[PDB]
């Protein structure tokens, strides 16, 4: 199947440079153009540029004024996007998309990479249980930076009735979020309700047991 897998999220100091990778698989890499499109939080889609990996030829959106460099490596089937002189305005989810001439557009997209342009240090989250007919339980994921944190239930198995709330920025300048799961009472003793938290910028991986 056609898949574009991007590199992990990260905080970058203002003025510095970030390089985002995009690993393509399930097709012949040099046959298709790879485009880069960004999305500032709560905002729209902004096209940044293109590379033809067959020739290494590029086209960039003029507004970036040479800050963008898109490259490709056929040995690894990996396209990269480098954005220099990082502005607080460059805080966005960066996407790579595979374009083709039968549609004329981006069909297969990567999962996106949130690059946060801040001066604040990387902080790993603390994870706490939200212990309980129909029952509710969850996980409080507190004091992390930057965004995002991903949460899964029962080692990545459960997804039905799983509400992972958007994070809130605290007065402290640290994020916090909760993940809840509306399960039955009978099942509370049967299955060990594991909350799997992952914060890719700090390599934290936490599995906290939620028991009454």
């Amino acid at each position: 199947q056609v898949q574009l897998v991007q590199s992990g999220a990260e905080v970058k100091k203002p003025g510095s440079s970030v390089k985002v990778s995009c690993k393509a698989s399930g097709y012949s890499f040099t046959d298709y153009h790879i485009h880069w499109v960004r999305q500032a939080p709560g905002q729209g889609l902004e096209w940044m540029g293109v590379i033809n990996p067959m020739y290494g030829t590029t086209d960039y959106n003029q507004r970036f004024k040479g800050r963008v460099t898109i490259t490709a490596d056929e040995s690894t089937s990996t396209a990269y996007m480098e954005l220099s002189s990082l502005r607080s305005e460059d805080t966005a989810v960066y996407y790579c998309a595979r374009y083709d001439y039968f549609t004329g557009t981006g069909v297969y997209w990567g999962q996106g990479t949130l690059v946060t342009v801040s001066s604040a240090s990387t902080k790993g989250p603390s994870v706490f249980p939200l212990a309980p007919g129909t029952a509710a339980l969850g996980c409080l994921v507190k004091d992390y930076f930057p965004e995002p944190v991903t949460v899964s239930w029962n080692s990545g198995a459960l997804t039905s009735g799983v509400h992972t709330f958007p994070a809130v920025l605290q007065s402290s300048g640290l994020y916090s979020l909760s993940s809840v799961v509306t399960v039955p009472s009978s099942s509370l003793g049967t299955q060990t309700y594991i909350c799997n938290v992952n914060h890719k910028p700090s390599n934290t991986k936490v599995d906290k047991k939620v028991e009454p």
Binding site: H35, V37, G44, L45, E46, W47, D59, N61, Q62, R63, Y95, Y99, T103, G104, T105, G106, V107, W109, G110, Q111, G112, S126, F128, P129, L130, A131, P132, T134, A136, G138, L140, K142, H163, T164, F165, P166, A167, V168, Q170, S176, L177, S178, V180, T182
Partner: protein
């Protein structure tokens, strides 16, 4: 650069009813004979944009006949006949005729389902968190409609202000409801000064406010 004007910016739609989104470009998107590079994407919350329609009216793999695109030159329209729960998300129109490629500002599609009352749950802070010197009390409002709701924190029947934060999920793709969390943050010391922690929920789907509470120590 070609400006893509999408209208309306938001839309509320009843299940089984049609919807229509319009895109207008600053210049013609005609590339050559039989080729207009105007596409439509749906982006469901926290997901990547997914192609629905390319080149004005072509439907992508798996895209149902309910989604139809039309138009020509500078004026185009996406139409959904029989809007379903799964159609919630943000719609974007795209042009790939002239560089730089441009997108519409997006159109948020919200479903207008029946009134659904929230199921309220309260969670006390964990002993493990208390060891850190802070207490987070959480109140969960699960699967409700509409989004509007009032959450009041009461500690020993005293009404709280300025010490709580809320978060609301986007509309659910299956039941079209919302979920909300309210977090009351107190120091370990202040938390220990009280017995009853309660969360009062006001919502259109509730005849009288619903209260869920716990006694600290139990």
């Amino acid at each position: 650069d070609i400006v893509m004007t999408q209208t309306p910016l938001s839309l509320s739609v009843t299940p089984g009813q049609p919807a229509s989104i319009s895109c207008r470009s600053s210049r013609s998107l005609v590339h050559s004979r039989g080729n207009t590079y105007l596409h439509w994407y749906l982006q469901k919350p926290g997901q990547s944009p997914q192609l629905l329609i390319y080149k004005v009216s072509n439907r992508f793999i798996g895209v149902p006949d309910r989604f139809s695109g039309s138009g020509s030159g500078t004026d185009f329209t996406l139409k959904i006949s029989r809007v379903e729960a799964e159609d919630v998300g943000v719609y974007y129109c795209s042009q790939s005729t002239h560089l730089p490629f441009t997108f519409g500002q997006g159109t948020k599609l919200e479903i207008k389902r029946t009134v659904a009352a929230p199921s309220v749950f309260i969670f006390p802070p964990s002993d493990e968190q208390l060891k850190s010197g802070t207490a987070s009390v959480v109140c969960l409002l699960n699967n409700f409609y509409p989004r509007e709701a009032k959450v009041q924190w009461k500690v020993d029947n005293a009404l709280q202000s300025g010490n709580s934060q809320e978060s609301v999920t986007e509309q659910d793709s299956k039941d079209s409801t919302y979920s909300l969390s309210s977090t009351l943050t107190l120091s370990k010391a202040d938390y220990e000064k009280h017995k009853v922690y309660a969360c009062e929920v006001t919502h259109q789907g509730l005849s009288s406010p619903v209260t869920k509470s716990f006694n600290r120590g139990e």
